[PDB]
Amino acid sequence: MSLLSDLCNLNLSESTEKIIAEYIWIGGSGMDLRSKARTLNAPVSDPSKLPQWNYDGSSTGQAPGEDSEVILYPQAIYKDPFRRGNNILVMCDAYTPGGEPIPTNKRFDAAKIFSHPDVVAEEPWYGIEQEYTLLQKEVKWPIGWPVGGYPGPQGPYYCGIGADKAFGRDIVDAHYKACLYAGINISGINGEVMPGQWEFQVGPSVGISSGDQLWMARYILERITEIAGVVVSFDPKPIEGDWNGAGAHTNYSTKSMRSDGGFEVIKKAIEKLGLKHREHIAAYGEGNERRLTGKHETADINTFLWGVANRGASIRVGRDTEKAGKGYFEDRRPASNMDPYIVTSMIANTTILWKP
Amino acid sequence: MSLLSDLCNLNLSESTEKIIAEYIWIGGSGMDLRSKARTLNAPVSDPSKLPQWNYDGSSTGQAPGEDSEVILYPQAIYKDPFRRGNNILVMCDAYTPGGEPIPTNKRFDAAKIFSHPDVVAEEPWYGIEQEYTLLQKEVKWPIGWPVGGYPGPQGPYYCGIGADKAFGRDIVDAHYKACLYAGINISGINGEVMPGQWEFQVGPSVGISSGDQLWMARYILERITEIAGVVVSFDPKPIEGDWNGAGAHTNYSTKSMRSDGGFEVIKKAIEKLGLKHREHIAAYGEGNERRLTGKHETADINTFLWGVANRGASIRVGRDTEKAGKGYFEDRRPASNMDPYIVTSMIANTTILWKP
Amino acid sequence: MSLLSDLCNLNLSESTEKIIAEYIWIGGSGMDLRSKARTLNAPVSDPSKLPQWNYDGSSTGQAPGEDSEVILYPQAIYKDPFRRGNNILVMCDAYTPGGEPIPTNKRFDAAKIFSHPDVVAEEPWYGIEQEYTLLQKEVKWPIGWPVGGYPGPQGPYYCGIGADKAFGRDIVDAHYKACLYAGINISGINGEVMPGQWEFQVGPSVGISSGDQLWMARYILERITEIAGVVVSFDPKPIEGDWNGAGAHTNYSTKSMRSDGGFEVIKKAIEKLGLKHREHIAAYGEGNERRLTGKHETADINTFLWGVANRGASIRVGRDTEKAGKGYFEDRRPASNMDPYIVTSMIANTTILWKP
Amino acid sequence: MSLLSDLCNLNLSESTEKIIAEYIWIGGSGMDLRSKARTLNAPVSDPSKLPQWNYDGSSTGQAPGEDSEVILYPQAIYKDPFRRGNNILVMCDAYTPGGEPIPTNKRFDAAKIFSHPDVVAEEPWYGIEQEYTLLQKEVKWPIGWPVGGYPGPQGPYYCGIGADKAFGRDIVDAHYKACLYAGINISGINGEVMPGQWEFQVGPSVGISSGDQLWMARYILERITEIAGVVVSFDPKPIEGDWNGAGAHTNYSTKSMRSDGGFEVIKKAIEKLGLKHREHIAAYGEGNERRLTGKHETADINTFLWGVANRGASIRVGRDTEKAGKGYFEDRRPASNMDPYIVTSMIANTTILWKP
Amino acid sequence: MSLLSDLCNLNLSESTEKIIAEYIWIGGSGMDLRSKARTLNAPVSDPSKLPQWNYDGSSTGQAPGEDSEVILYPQAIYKDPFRRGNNILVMCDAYTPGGEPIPTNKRFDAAKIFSHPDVVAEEPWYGIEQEYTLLQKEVKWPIGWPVGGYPGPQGPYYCGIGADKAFGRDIVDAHYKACLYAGINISGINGEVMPGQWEFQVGPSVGISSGDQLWMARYILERITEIAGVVVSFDPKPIEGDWNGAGAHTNYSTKSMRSDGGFEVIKKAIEKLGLKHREHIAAYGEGNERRLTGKHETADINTFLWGVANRGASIRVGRDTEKAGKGYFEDRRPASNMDPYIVTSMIANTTILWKP
């Protein structure tokens, strides 16, 4: 189209020297994201030089009814894909005046854990595999499904090509381009054994940058999906039928594990993480009850078991690590609406800081 | 349109230096193709430097067993038409951990038979004439045909121009441009006697590059018709009533045939191929019995006829070849869903290595 | 639409040196045109340095059922408007193995008669005024025309501007641009009395080349209207009723007539044309029985007339020719589906060779 | 619908005794019909008492320039299916002012022929089998034909049954019941091989009654299909190609042919009919040339063939009729757009008055 | 609408005592029917009193080339549900001119078998159940069937109620009432597991009457669904996949089995049926092998299984029947496209005449 499309893609440095910095903060329910733009004066490149901002804490649902002002802090800056130029995107944190973070921040303790000398001397690496569903505008069925109906049986959809196999690859391709342009270290994408569903894998990020990049990628996906004209649901089981349930896996790797002869280290880490499976399964995301039932390459909710090749194992280890004696292992417990901060912090703490 | 079309065509070489590389492997049923992308780090030009992957063996219906990982070996690299820049497309063949090919690979034997000193001394040339149908998204009739109805009788459609003659020349022209840009040695296109059917002829490739290029061209066509929202079927008889049945032909040549007085060579090779007619029929296509019936310039399923201008002959030789004493002969047996690897290997073996 | 529009418009000179030469030959019924593309290795500029193709002579209906191969010879090369670059369009004439022109060739005798020393010493000039109707895709009424209805009385449409007067000036303007770009020596366009109808004038093309010019212009028009989405019919009476009938006229000129004392020469030529009239009126086109009736500025089938100003005269002379000699005369006998080769050949032959 | 039906079927006899009479006369073309109604004070039963009434002949193209008045002579009385009650349908003949028939009357001569003492003393019987095609309102395709296409080949369409096999049998049933009600001798109905073409047999009414009843049945049919919203065309070849046409089988038999052993009289009658085949065909109606070629169980216009059980013969005699030695025979040559008056009158003239 | 239906339900007997005879005969395929109508002069009740009539067998594809005439023999008189009054539907058998039956008759042999003194002295009754699917008119999916998809898994569809559970039950109910009215012994109806599939039990009629009534019920059903704009296919497996198909259960019981100690007699009859089951399967109908694979409550083609409460056996005997020691048994092996004449006559033959 050409209506309103000339003004949106208008060069910024031609006239003035002003950029705009959209502000992103975690919403009230813990999963929704909110954003509101604000002009700047000079193109900034240091996240510590940005000015703090605020929003109404009683409209979203993060503050009581006596004092709604919620001070925000800027954390990271990423290049704006939807308006290019020198515009930036920032990730912010919700705090109350007086320096106390809101109960629904989840990044204060994450940064506290990851500022420890041990973790900064170990620098763990995390790779997250996110799975999301694309739903229609109104009916709220996945796109491509007939209204009140279902497509053919699953199996000829995984990494499919052509029509009737991939529904809406434009959104995912645009997402890939935008995250490669912004600065997020994305790795690759593929289909999933459910039609409409997809998946993108975030690369080996260090520290809390994993959570930062995952959140920014979720924001980019939501904006691109809004541009297209559909909605995205991150819940673990979008459809209650007999289809794949969305989830997430977390690659784990520290310096000692991938240095030399790390098989014993990964093994001991498996027992360490299995010791406290209770709180870990309780703190990986609401809605995991309908995902982990015993079907569709999933384990059971109240059991812990690990293997080397079985796809039903809650935690598995790549056979390449066994070949070489060093590598990683896959944590297949987290659901598709998890908070990367808490999961990453719990894994790092239970692995490197806990002394039984 | 401008809905996300600006983001898809974004030059990634201006900001970053990384490229992406889609992976293509032969599916489970033998005809389906699957793809999933990844991000490399440097623009590669040697196929031997690429890293290997795997995929879910129990999702494509070729699971070796408990260990579902299916290692993939990159073979050839082609420039990406749908993303331009330094993006590439690669062709991969399936394998199992342990160095053995998957049962539905059919490329291991082809490579091991085309690495023979004799065949590399003779360097056969193959020209493949693939013909496909374009059929609608929903009712599965060919595009242009009325729903539950038929257009005028065949005859005014062959190489037709204008509306009511060519149904979707845009898609085929885009395919031709993309194949010429990628690196495939495509020769030309033309219509066939049916509304919707078409044809593209692949040029004189050498060795297993014939199968590589044919498979990559099929992938490119399928992606393009996915962009256009149309499904493509390669089966020999898309419509069973009266119309022309799709198939394929295989030009063949070696050094002796096109250099010396090779009329005797080509004729004796024709009897050689006629001696092994049984498994050659059995190994050209699933569903070929609906094509070869005795009508529409097709041979029968129980005879082997070769001549000079017999339109129904299973094999014919070029008249310029006979007049000049050197050239090629045309194999009209293969169907439209063939595997180029097996047909190429069988022809080469039966004509240069197999002896009475 | 931005779908598939990026791939179609690509600059192949950026990556390779290959071009695309599309072959055009006169079909079986005499009026249909057929095409199929190929890939030349290097750009060419001499029409005598091209390879010869063939096609299935039994599919079109132009060759017998024994040896369907139909050798084609390239004649002229024109720049491709629909893909630009170094791509070319070639005009080809059919034949049979053995060098014998097909019964429906009609260009062999044209070239033979125009290679005569007298003709090449006289260099006749022909200007052709072709008029065509644009029909809808399905109903087969003209465009901008109610189904089962009529727009209104004629008179406000001739050279009309604005809506309700010109139905599809976009297609004709595109045709004008493409013909000026290709190499055709087109002169001008205008509307015609009945709505939907149009007219373009090919102007002063010397020698046999007039047939090539007009045929390539027809091909360009038909491809352009295929792109638009409507069909075009060249029959003399597209719609039966009280409406203007389509046709054609042929300007004629030779060195003697446009030299000093040319009025006597043109009068002698008109008398000669009147003397040999039966085969002329039987060879100008199939469909004159509905055009030449006696109405709408048209002569009668059973008469021959000449004049300077009468609109119903079968032939006439331009006024400036009468005033100041030189000039030409307009042959108003040919219909709208004529073969230019035979018409120009007989006109030149009757003018310069036959004696009473 | 709910309204415009209560007062369209309202009963008038309950209030008064005024009836409605529709006067029917043939237009100038000779293939369509005209009708207009006139109130009568009291109900009538015999056509003799109905007074004559005039109509404008200028618009019908049957009147001289000065005096444009035409007089009608009521002939037959039939009841009205669209008004019920005592309302009547009456057939009329156009007469010049002065006691002479209109040139396009075609019934005065028939009445003179049939009123001859020998003709009435022979009591002829006539049976006609007319066929028609139901076609749409705008696109002029037959009902059920996919627009811009053709349905399946000949097959389950000749007197077929079921959805997608027989189109619009409700109109045929409506005609059958209405013509049984009105007073028209209808024998039976059955579909035709072309999808959308039907047929109804008119009973063995005697003399001028056969023509009168057939004209009235055609009037009722075209009124019914006007009500339904479908145009009916009785042309012998509504659709040209590989589909059957429409004809009439005028079965002839007088008192002698069904009383004694007329097995040797039927052949004499056939020969008498065939003595003047040329003008006999010429007196049948336009469109006869495109149907009689030999295919679709038809005969040849320029040859006279007679047989026993061959559909290729112009005249055919049933096996039971020839076995019994008495009965009738089938006259297949008359066209479906004939004038029944002329056909029956001239057949009677040939049979009883004309001599070899 | 109100019009075009008032005169489709008129009282023809009000004016004249003419009745309408609907002649019915099987086409050449053996799975569809044909219809023809004619006016009789007086109402009849005895089928033998109805005169013979002929149809053109060339289009039917079951007539000799020289003599296309085919003679019909009325068999059974059933009252009309679409015209009411005294109008009748009659089932007819096609006879060649000469006495010998049509090759595709299947009724003369059945009549000879059933007219044998032993068969009529045993007075068998047959119970036949048939199942069918209600397909759409353009896309060949069932009714209520989400296009481009499938409905929920097999759930509340077997004789279910409510919207979105039972589709198009109005057609089935109208068929039930119409078959009760016409004179066909129909027992009951219920839904089927596949959404849109139904069935109706035909009551225990005698011998040839069972086949005649089944044919007439199929005729009436297809007429009704033609009125409703829905096509009906009695295929053994209309849709391939994880959905149930359609079959035919024949309930056979003669005097001996129904009386006294019939358990041993029915067991002996079952063994007699199983002795030569190969031609039994061969003489039921095409498409049986797709339906008979083992799943969806059926036996295997190559294996003969019998039992009492096992649905996997080709023969099932009710618990009450065996408890009482007398009754019938169910033959699940017939296909949904069977010929009732052949099945009934063959069952009677193998029961009473054919010996081991």
Residue numbers in the entry:
A (entry chain A), B (entry chain G), C (entry chain F), D (entry chain I), E (entry chain B): 1 to 356
Text lifted from the article:
Decades of studies have established a striking notion that all three classes of GS enzymes, despite of dramatic differences in amino acid sequences and protein sizes, share quaternary geometry in dihedral symmetry assembled with two oligomeric rings. Considering that the active sites of GS are located at the clefts formed between two neighboring protomers within the same ring and distal to the ring-ring interface, each isolated GS subcomplex ring holds multiple integral catalytic sites. Cryo-EM structure determination of GS in both the catalytically active and inactive assembly states allows us to reveal an unanticipated self-assembly-induced disorder-order transition paradigm, in which the remote interactions between two subcomplex entities significantly rigidify the otherwise structurally fluctuating active sites, thereby regulating activity.
To elucidate the detailed mechanism of how the interactions between two GSII pentameric rings remotely trigger enzymatic activity, we next employed single-particle cryo-EM imaging technique and first determined the structures of GmGSβ2 decamer, as well as that of the CsGSIb that adopts decameric configuration (thereafter named as CsGSIbDec). The active sites of GmGSβ2, CsGSIbDec are structurally highly similar to each other, as well as to that of the maize GSII, suggesting the catalysis mechanisms of these plant GSIIs are essentially identical. The overall buried inter-ring surfaces for both GmGSβ2 and CsGSIbDec amount to ~2000 Å2, that is approximately only 400 Å2 per individual monomer–monomer interaction. This highlights the weakness of the inter-ring contacts, characteristic of type II GS. Indeed, in both structures the inter-ring contacts are established by only a limited number of hydrophobic and polar interactions provided by the residues 136–141 and 146–152 segments of each of the intervening subunits, which behave as two gear teeth (thereafter named as tooth-1 and tooth-2, respectively) interlocking the two pentameric rings.
